[PDB]
Structures are given as C-alpha cells and as structure tokens.
C-alpha cells in the first residue's frame, strides 16, 4: 500500500501551492510539515495528472500549480510554515 | 517542455536503481549529477508509471524498482474469434 499514502500527502502540498506557487521543495515542506524527500515524491503524484508543471530558474527547482492555467485563487490569507 | 526535461532525468535516476536500487535520494542524487530536489522530482516521473516502491524505514525513505514487484503481466484481450 503506497498510492493510498501519496495520494493522501499529495493534496495538502498541492494545497500550500493554491496560496502561493513557485516555491522550492524545503520551504514548501515547513508549511505542510512533511519531510523533503515525502513532499518532492507527493509532488510526483500531482505531476502524474500535471497538477504541478516544473520550472528551472537558475538551477533552482520551482513547483507550480495547474492553477494558473485555469483557476487559482489565494483567497486563504497565506498559511504560515512551522 | 516539463514532461521532456524529466523524463529524461528520470531514465538516468532509474538506470542507477535497475544496477543499485533502495538507496536513499541524496545517495543517488550525487551517483545521477542532479541535486536531491532534481532526483525526488525525477523518482516522481517513475512514481507516475509506479516504477518505484517508496518504504519509509524508521521514518527514512528508500526507493526501490519495479523489478521486484513483477505483477505488471495480465490477461489477453478476449475477443470473438472469425
């Protein structure tokens, strides 16, 4: 059993993104509170649909939501990391 | 081109799992030439065809290949024979 768990992870990464995406995979884990190699591998499970579309600036690895194609709204006032 | 870039980073981090597989990301990431961020989102690429097994020992996560789970086969396509 392993697509039940990155399927679950997968929607509250993809959630943080829906807020603000363009974000880097250890900043993104602090707000969902998952460790990097869960929150780069529930991302995976997102790029399997194209829930997420991968950009490279730099050599640094951004994460952006399908959103920004369709329909995004950061109407949730900004969720604060830990 | 998102899909193009990591799909062929993603047959170069699973060409290093069919020789040396259940390593850890960082592990691989400095076998591959890419950074950890790089070689996750590229084990995500497999993820989406469930060419790897993700196992969370003592919370540390391994990525193993398909090879070992060789239940990929099925049945034929039954059809009406004329």
Same mark, same amino acid.
């Given at each position: 059993?392993?697509?039940?768990?990155?399927?679950?992870?997968?929607?509250?990464?993809?959630?943080?993104?829906?807020?603000?995406?363009? %974000?880097? %995979?250890?900043?993104?884990?602090?707000? =969902?509170?998952?460790? =990097?190699?869960?929150?780069?591998?529930?991302?995976?499970?997102?790029?399997?649909?194209?829930?997420? =579309? %991968?950009?490279?600036?730099?050599?640094?690895?951004? %994460?952006?939501?399908?959103?920004?194609?369709?329909?995004?709204?950061?109407?949730?006032?900004?969720?604060?990391?830990?």
């Amino acid at each position: 059993m392993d697509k039940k768990i990155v399927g679950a992870n997968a929607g509250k990464v993809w959630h943080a993104l829906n807020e603000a995406d363009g %974000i880097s %995979i250890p900043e993104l884990a602090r707000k =969902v509170n998952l460790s =990097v190699e869960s929150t780069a591998l529930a991302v995976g499970w997102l790029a399997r649909e194209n829930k997420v =579309v %991968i950009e490279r600036k730099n050599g640094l690895i951004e %994460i952006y939501n399908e959103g920004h194609f369709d329909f995004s709204f950061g109407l949730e006032h900004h969720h604060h990391h830990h």
